[PDB]
Write a protein that binds this ligand. Structure first.
Ligand SMILES: [Mn+2]
Ligand SMILES: [Mn+2]
Lengths: 198, 198
């Protein structure tokens, strides 16, 4: 069923912000494992022929016996597939969302400050998200590989704050990693995901 | 009130099992942060002059306004204080508990298998525990910095499977880390904690 998407750039395309060793491991091992376990959980079930977005949006309906496996690895598959596409070696802070951000938060900087506090505050493994909730933009975080789509909020930007995403280059300094992320945001993709809600 | 406990050995004393850079960061930053934040949550209160074990044990009646900070950072302070004392550069597979394990699981290698499978199955950030409950041994894992003492079960052995504990040396290879752990278990301390429940 599901497959591991190829990266849209080289492992080292995001240095010096995200290190090449991490990009390789993160994608080829961690993501891939999410795919393997996800396929095992869904094979033989109604979920097999569903899209990853459809599975995660309707995770509350998934049978109790495979719900955790799908929640965690389906989560994993969706979240990382989004993540790779939301990164870019030549981020431009412009476009539809940067403008909606500017209008809602006053500055792009004010927005980053709020995103960074919430992302740093996520205790344990999780993700920080910019989501649209019924037309309105808001910053939420989730534990582990949970995704706001499960609660009917469309994510348009996400940062992975599992320690495996930053430890090799940043060790404990998660605030420095979040700071480096801004330089590699794929705002074009962010736009594409926002405009898909309209 | 609370203080960062000193390590009973050198930063490099557990090599080649747990690397020295990890031990230093793990102890000086990660554990220290749990201590700083716990101190902020309990200062000027009842809890300040209590022992970390009794705080964590009676977390369920700690007022809802500081519960999360105590749970996370107190739990953090407890779990790591146990962890450092539960490790040794002079590890020796004998004693009261080894014998009980032998009796209950059949062998050490059987008990290790079940411990290693559960430790590897803990999704996200967490700990794997050997606990005394109802005068029997039981393997359980907990999320984040939760400790089975809160659910009335006395832990006697504990393994940190937060990615910070192993990423620098093992990266994604959590099983290899669990494998190395066996070589530095301080079973003299496990005996002491087990015998304290009698
Ligand atoms: Mn990840
Ligand atoms: Mn730890």
């Amino acid at each position: 069923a599901f497959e591991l998407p190829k990266l849209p750039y080289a492992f080292d395309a995001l240095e010096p912000h995200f290190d090449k060793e991490t990009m390789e491991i993160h994608h080829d091992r961690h993501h891939n494992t999410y795919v393997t376990k996800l396929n095992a959980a869904v094979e033989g079930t109604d979920l097999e022929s569903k899209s990853i977005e459809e599975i995660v949006a309707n995770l509350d309906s998934v049978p109790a016996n495979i719900q955790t496996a799908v929640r965690n690895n389906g989560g994993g598959h969706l979240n990382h597939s989004l993540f790779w596409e939301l990164l870019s070696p030549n981020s431009e802070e412009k476009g539809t969302v940067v403008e909606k951000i500017k209008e809602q938060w006053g500055s792009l900087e004010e927005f980053k400050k709020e995103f960074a506090d919430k992302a740093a505050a996520r205790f344990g493994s999780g993700w920080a998200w910019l989501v649209v909730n019924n037309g309105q933009l808001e910053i939420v975080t989730t534990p582990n590989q949970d995704n706001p789509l499960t609660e009917g909020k469309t994510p348009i930007l996400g940062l992975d704050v599992w320690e495996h995403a930053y430890y090799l280059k940043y060790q404990n300094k998660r605030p420095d990693y979040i700071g480096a992320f801004w330089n590699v945001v794929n705002w074009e993709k962010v736009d594409e995901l926002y405009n898909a809600t309209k």
